[PDB]
């Protein structure tokens, strides 16, 4: 995600090189109903479950600033 200004598709491709050959229990999801795109298919103690991508990567991103609390520490409350 610190690689900027780029698209989850990039990682899709990196999946496809990285795991999609290698990692047996993970899978390209088959076609199935209910959904426009699903991207990951892997196997679990519950059984085997398949899941999908919106570009959301940045959502996990954590910014920090000292300053914000830094000054709130001054504040009255």
């Amino acid at each position: 995600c610190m690689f900027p200004k780029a698209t989850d598709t990039s990682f899709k491709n990196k999946l496809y090189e990285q795991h999609l050959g290698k990692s047996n229990n993970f899978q390209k999801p088959k076609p199935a109903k209910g959904k426009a795109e699903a991207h990951f298919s892997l196997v679990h103690y519950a059984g085997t479950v398949d899941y999908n991508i919106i570009g959301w990567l940045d959502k996990n991103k954590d910014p920090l600033n000292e300053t914000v609390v830094g000054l709130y520490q001054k504040s009255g409350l």
Partner: protein
Amino acid sequence: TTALVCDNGSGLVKAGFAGDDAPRAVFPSIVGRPRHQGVMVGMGQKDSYVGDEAQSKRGILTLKYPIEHGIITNWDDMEKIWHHTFYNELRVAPEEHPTLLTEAPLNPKANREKMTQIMFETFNVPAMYVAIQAVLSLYASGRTTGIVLDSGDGVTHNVPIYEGYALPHAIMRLDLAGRDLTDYLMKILTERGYSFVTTAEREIVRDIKEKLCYVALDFENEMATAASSSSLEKSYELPDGQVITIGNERFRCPETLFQPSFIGMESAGIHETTYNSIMKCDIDIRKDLYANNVMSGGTTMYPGIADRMQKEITALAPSTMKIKIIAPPERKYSVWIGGSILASLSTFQQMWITKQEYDEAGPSIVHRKCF
């Protein structure tokens, strides 16, 4: 289920189900690879790139061009292209449909044999067919007789077809297509001497071929206007960067078709080839073809070709008899459209290759079974 057709007429590549009016999307069949050390470690290295993805990415990529002269150069590259096209555009699995293949006529068996071999083995696909361009051209144009000229990205054609039959002796086949013309263009262009040679730089010309070309009505007279006027001369930008402004260098280009001196060969040209090939074919039919004259695809896009063609035929024909040509709007798509029609009719169910034959006999099957 449902039935799917690939166009591999060269240039951008066209694919679509039977009965859609136009293919879903279309791709150049460029192939390209990196040129420089990969120095963003953050980047994933992919070593080969194709399609508009590459068309964006081009600059550090360098191109290979997997079809020369309509002959497909390097099979595994094709396989890359083909796989990509199915999965990325089509979201399609090889089992899903019969698939129909689009061929230059009169060209080496090898393309047949490996193409089928790969696509039945590498892909596994219910039914296969390979079909000659002109047939589609008629079906779309809907006149059972005819002669076709279609000079695409690739090798350039004359076929008379009579209604319901081939005249394979009649046929003429030429490597004069627009790509090589374009590469001649540069040897023009250095006269003004804004000058660049590489593959991508060569494709930049394609845009100019879209925009800036038009057909010479008369060559001498045009030269006289060239001496008179600059309206013949138009001003055009780099795709980015400069404005560029171009003289006779535009119209001079198509004349190569009429005179392949400028990159020098002898075959007396499109029109004289055509009338030659006529005079091969027999006497009575000829009037129909004088009536029914049909053109398509890459070169034909230019405004005006049909007119000077008619001028040429009026030169060569006995003027006494009717002459006309057809110039449909959609010619560049025509082939795949015709292919869709071709796909529609149940008779190919009689006609398709099936996996079973490929099991029981080799690629050899095709050359009997298909044209």
